[PDB]
Amino acid sequence: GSHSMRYFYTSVSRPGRGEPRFIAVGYVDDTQFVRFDSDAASQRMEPRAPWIEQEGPEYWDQETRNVKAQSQTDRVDLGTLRGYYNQSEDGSHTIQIMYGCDVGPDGRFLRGYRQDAYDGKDYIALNEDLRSWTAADMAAQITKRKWEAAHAAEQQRAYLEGRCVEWLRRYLENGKETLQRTDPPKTHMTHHPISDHEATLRCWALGFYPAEITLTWQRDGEDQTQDTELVETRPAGDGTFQKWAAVVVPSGEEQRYTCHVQHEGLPKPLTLRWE
């Protein structure tokens, strides 16, 4: 029963090197709890979960200061990179940062993350040992040389193994009724004829949390992969998720096919056959 906290930073530059757009979000597993938007009026770290509004004003102050500090640093790097790659002054360019930590059931540190991207492709990443970097080409190679000589990975490791783990447990405890719960999926099957010889059996899974789910078809007990469609897990907008799997079956053989659903909230994996 491991849990995760993840932060996603995004800095998009404006034409003429104007004030760039900065958006930051925070997640505990698949639940967003904080957000920041430079286009928002408050210009503050806003809450996005019921259990995070419990934090006092000292929390929202320091969290607003630290996300501002990173955005201003991404703003300077965006201009430095635009002149490095001689990129047009009338375009937009993006710097993304993803970082977080993993804890086990006992609440101890499992693994850390810290990696950046420029214009959609990997820039520099903190390796799993939290002591070395994996950088891309050219401009990223200067960053790797710069961060190695400054021992920058030491304080990055200190946050991921320290403040990240400490506050992830606090969030998991303050919102245990939201984060440590598993909402099982509500399953059913639909039938959609294609012609007089074929038809589509669609197997639904609605309102489940977390998003990790597995849908598989079978024919006479054997794994059926031929003529199978599977859409990505989509958000329902209420905190839960949706996903369905389809298969084209010949007419009169619908009951030969069974849908199998695996989810954390299910004590036993479900099996659905057309009735």
Binding site: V25, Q32, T94
Partner: protein, 100 residues
Amino acid sequence: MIQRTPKIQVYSRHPAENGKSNFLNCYVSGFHPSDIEVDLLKNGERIEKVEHSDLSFSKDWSFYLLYYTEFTPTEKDEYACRVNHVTLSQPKIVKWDRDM
């Protein structure tokens, strides 16, 4: 730059039931950069009050967003999602299907 074409899904929060209020969702994902124009259409006309989620991205750095609004489906009214992106020559319009 690496650029990615968005993936568009149109669906409802709850199963469609004519006469009952629901939420019409349009989930765009797997695109880059993040600048994207998404409108929700009713019989071809842009729905005015439409909110969206906060910008986030996946492990492959591609962004995703959820554009939603409150609506009530009927038998004759049509709904769709119109997405425009730098990777799209023409804006892509995905119709709503209560079976998908």
